[model samples]
Target chain A: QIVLTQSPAIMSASPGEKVTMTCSASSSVSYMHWYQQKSGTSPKRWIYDTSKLASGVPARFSGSGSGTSYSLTISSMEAEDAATYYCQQWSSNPPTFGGGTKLELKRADAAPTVSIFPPSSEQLTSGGASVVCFLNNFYPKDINVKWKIDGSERQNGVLNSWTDQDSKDSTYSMSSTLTLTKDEYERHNSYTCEATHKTSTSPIVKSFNRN
Target chain B: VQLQQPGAELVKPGASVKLSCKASGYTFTSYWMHWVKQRPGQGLEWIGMIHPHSGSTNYNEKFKSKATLTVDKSSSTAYMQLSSLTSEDSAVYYCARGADVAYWGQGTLVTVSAAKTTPPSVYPLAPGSAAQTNSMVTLGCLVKGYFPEPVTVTWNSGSLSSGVHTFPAVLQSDLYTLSSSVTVPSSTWPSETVTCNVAHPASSTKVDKKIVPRD
Candidate 1:
């Protein structure tokens, strides 16, 4: 009986505030491990034993609890502290992460700025070339990004993005890259990267072709 | 213990799609069919599982509402239904058999897109860098966006660079942003470019690259 449960899967708060997320297990275990996955990156172990923070994490974040109940708490939440958090259990096989808790920064803001990155100079084939899409300066991080080639959607690509904190006026930036061949590159006019966020009334799209 | 999933699928946001996992050479009801999610070139995450016989389910609390687990006792098939689709839900969903004999299935690609969200504008596609300590050294990077989800991050891990993940988030102002870093062993390895794929619902697929951070 190895299962992990979380509460208030989605949370909204502002800087200088405090918030906490929890994990409930179906069975008892020796201990619990937690991971924090900020929207654009991979997941990393954040807390252990309900008190120990991850590698460089400061004292503000703490983890505690044993048995079926465990929690990760932030003494004081900051703008950079928002992201999804998941809890993992080791006492069981296959291990597991609770459904993620996306801690959002509640604010009303502007739309994203969109663009594209031509492939790396080294990899030039349209099939293998890197076509990158970027979205920046939006408030809500739950925005959407989608792509299309020659009017049809292309599935082979990579994605990544991060925010640049410039004090209280902090904003976000993001990107997606696709490796395609010459034929596709020449038809660049056909590729498109579209996006939308809470602030926008309609979708924002950046096409492969500048013209 | 062979597990099979349906071919890739493309659906729009706010829509619903069902994923199938069929098992062979295994008792249909005796074991459980578990589903896992891998976004493009990212890591593997367990979604949930179901019992074929009774149709009883145990979901990862996160996916409890988004994913519905059901089994076809007659066909030895397990299904997962994802609702209110969005690009964030796009990824390769794999099904495995948990006999208490676990064998994983190939993959069933999922793309919940089309209604492009506002995000992913112009930004630098920087490679990841490393930070070292006494015994272990870790490499870190960030992926930014106002997204249903951040872009996928992959580590084109060198010979010795493995185990990359996300941690340490920062606030840009009022919005949220994500950061991911990979750790290396005591020694160092060179590097390769980790690309970012626009999880465009328009395309509905996770391309073969991961995201790295800034200049």
Candidate 2:
């Protein structure tokens, strides 16, 4: 078995631009494949052969070359396609994957728009409720969301994130949710949602009251 | 584990109540017995546990000082006493083998359990609400639903003293709902904000809310 190393580990591009990532194996390999992974989703196969697109991949993404060298080309970059991409070779008995390349675009100098649709007031009086925070249209595309109840940190929550549907801009969005019981949500209790952007030192936060 | 009688209990806010949790299905002191605050609506919350091996106790950070946990080897029973009761503290509390927690006591109703602590919250009666009257402003401030009595609500601006009013606390179910109002002349209003601060014993750290004056 041989090792594989991907170059330009970190990269970014605007929509319509062409971007290429390379993979090199420690020894000559006959075949290579590629994969793409978005932050909150699972990694998926993007290329099956050195030059063939995988099952449902878009035509813009293509791969080629083999032996000790191989490459994957994203012919026209789109906002939704910006994510981490990796290369793998199976010619060796034990397959190996190269270090991934994280592709992102320079933020369009915009801060995320944040909103929290907190659990209804009724839920606070008698039962449980789900609190969802929607953070939209941010650039540099990276953000962290958290929940705090009655001024204390709440440890449990579920988070989902994704980019806009192949839109022309580089902005992305993220969402985080937390569920609380009557015991967790009580009259007079306060819930707050905060979002921290990659470029700003101050966090944007919104607060809700349980009446 | 099997639990004995007098399963239900009642107490007034500011008072204390101790409930018994007797176990028999398993050896009592051999394992840690943990407590859970079971509310009528949703999930169970871990209230902490007592180590039988040692006399030490560990409580949920929320319940830490609010409860005093004890055990009697001769009686093979565990006890949890909550101090300073409130409506939110009313619930069925249960005990179980710390490791399983699956095997539990029949449950004792204190009528309470969340005698627990939480910092208070102070906010404007109306956010982004305002009216300009003869160059004067009437901003509403409310300090509601705070636990453990002795909650003070104050308007920091000295000029707004048109008159300070503290409303009587309404004893709803098991807690108190209180609100006070302050009127300030438009000249006294700051372009940026006015603050409402609440001080309570449940939490030594005070709570304050700032409302931005509408233009």
Candidate 3:
């Protein structure tokens, strides 16, 4: 089964504006499911197979779109629903989840921007050869981290570290790392750090070349 | 509208069987029903339930791999097909409206036996306690009737060790009436307080008890 990739996080304008999260399957999936998790309760089923609602669910919440790309819209966002939202795909087994998106009260002056950090950059050295991969800018501590070559999944030793640097805006910066050997990083092979964050808009992938 | 679920057929003790319920009266797409099972001599087990409008499903943890609930909204009907039929699965099945026990269909029974096991336990009423000061109480449970000749009533303090006190009951058409009464001790009784719980052949869970205190 292909894993799904979601973004680290997202922010949006208060009531009227729309915030979208993407869920891309390792391979294309026919349908995607969406769930909304409020503070202390069990996650409620919002939309299934893209836009279907469970019985008794409110009409203000709507889901639309499909494939590698999909969107969840909350009409006139309510304060009570502010929390994380996740998208998942049931088309395959070992079902995959997107990194979550947090919907909060939007500041009047702060323009909502959805920023995606590429994976961290890594460097590997062997008998006269070198390899590197980059992974960065993701959130929600739970995810499957691994390496892939030429579009095929590969098993490699990984080293991960996180540093929370306080910037003036009070937002902290974080990073992660993974390493692979030369023989495993063969010719016609492209190294990619596949970080499967269940809550993000979609999986964030960073590619590198083996020298 | 009433729903008469299709009765399951008996096969060799080790085979599997399935049954269905055809609904009439309301639009099937607008409502949902829960599927339940009651073995020949056991309590009712909630297998799972289905949403006719969306085809979404939820199964009891125990029934996850055994029972599959599906609906043909177009036909205003629902189906429960059981696999790996065993004497263990031979019981009456029912379809109920939402979660309300008050609304239920006359159940259908399926018997499987190379040799019949002991009949289901009989429940008897607990001895009534002395009446409390100014308290009004009613004690009895309701069991809706279905096929399969006899119906028996028993009651206790909701435990097996308390044992059953069986009472003879009368069956009328689709309704069967079996009951037991309990007297509350003065110390346990509050004015106008009473409780009634229903036990039936198809419930996997215990009958619910409603406590009504006199005003």
Candidate 4:
């Protein structure tokens, strides 16, 4: 079991200003996960590996940290961005989560902001009987991307994605791809990319269809 | 979602059974699957859950080492094999889709007939009458000899309607208890007999008592 420690409370910030909170792990943690919680709803994942933004997350909010210290940064904080943020560690059992960091608007003390980041692009590659669709630029790691056919939420193919945290820019990036049949893709079926973080803003949802 | 039990045969006191639940849902490895046990007079036991994608398992601590949970992401299914089977493992085992415990499977039952031990007694403690005003009554049941045990109390007024139930903050002993309250609304009180049902994992026999309220 890993122990995740986050500041019990964080204050609000004005728009365009950067606010950062720290997530400290009891031991050396490879990945520092961040999530946002608003009111009575479930938590939504915002960043992982410290600085990477999960797909659909605004470019303004980013995360960065390593070892025992990690931080979630909101650049040009928005009014609606106020909410509680948590950091988690997937390195061990009973996946540990930080208590939570609450983000609120600087002046109004109003409703928190929540956002979903979608994949920048999706590409389909055909291989004989099977057609593969690739989703690029999903960050903050660990997500699920599936192919929904004909508007139905059914599993139609195999999917795979990879994360790259080695870039010098410090932002983590990942990609996911699903392989299906020609008929399945030509049906103008909608495919979705979803990222689920136990204690984050909300599952980021993005969809695409093949004509 | 095809669930398979890798059949196991064990002796009365020393043996146990292991059950597995696989899924064909949207993404098998991503979401969490919770395990529940349904016994004769008892309701459902929240055994625990496994995150198939991460292979992380969380138990009630009451189950501790008694039940081992495993998941094969490649196959998109979860395996839960119980150890140290006594007549205790005989109830129906269900695999729920998420933490809600509302969506469930048909359930599997493991029986310990070889042993001479008798199952725990399940008794109803609430909802004393059939009066319409008293229709909304809380039903309670007690199960002996299971720590961090799982029990669900249900009320039936002719037709079985799911009632709101809550688990107490404290456990009495190996004796675990739960309660469910149902309101009969003046319209249905005189016509229906409120029945309290208790279920456990050892047997499918549901012990129930009809509560006839005083006018």
Kindly provide the TM-score of model 3 when superposed on the true structure, using C-alpha atoms: 0.28
Query: Which candidate number has the best lDDT?
Result: 2
Between candidates 1 and 3, name the one with more favorable lDDT. Answer: 1
Cα deviation of A166, candidate 4, in Å: 44
TM-score of the second chain, each candidate in turn, equals 0.51, 0.49, 0.50, 0.47
TM-score of 4: 0.35
Q: Write the per-residue lDDT of candidate 1 for residues A111-169, one digit (tens) a residue.
A: 76554544443344214445555555567667767687777766655445554432344
Better of 1 and 4 by lDDT: 1
Q: Which stretches of candidate 4 lie over 4 Å from their true place?
A: A1-3, A9-22, A26-31, A34-47, A53-211, B1-118, B127-150, B157-163, B168-172, B186-191
Docking class of 4: incorrect
**lDDT tens digits, residue span A1-211, model 4:** 5667776465645678877788887787776777665533334546766576666778887677867788777778875676677776666554556756655443321111111111111212322122222222223333444445455655634423232222222122232234344454454545444545323446544444423
Q: A1-211 in candidate 2: lDDT tens per residue?
A: 4777777977868789888889888898776767676643334556666776665688997776766788888888876777887776545544456677788875566876554554434334545455555555567755666677777777765534354422444465554556546564554367777777876857777677734
Candidate 3, residues B66-87, lDDT tens digits: the string is: 7788878777778877776665
What's model 1's lDDT at A142? 72
Evaluate model 3: give its lDDT: 0.49
What interface RMSD does every candidate have?
A: 12.9, 19.0, 30.8, 27.0
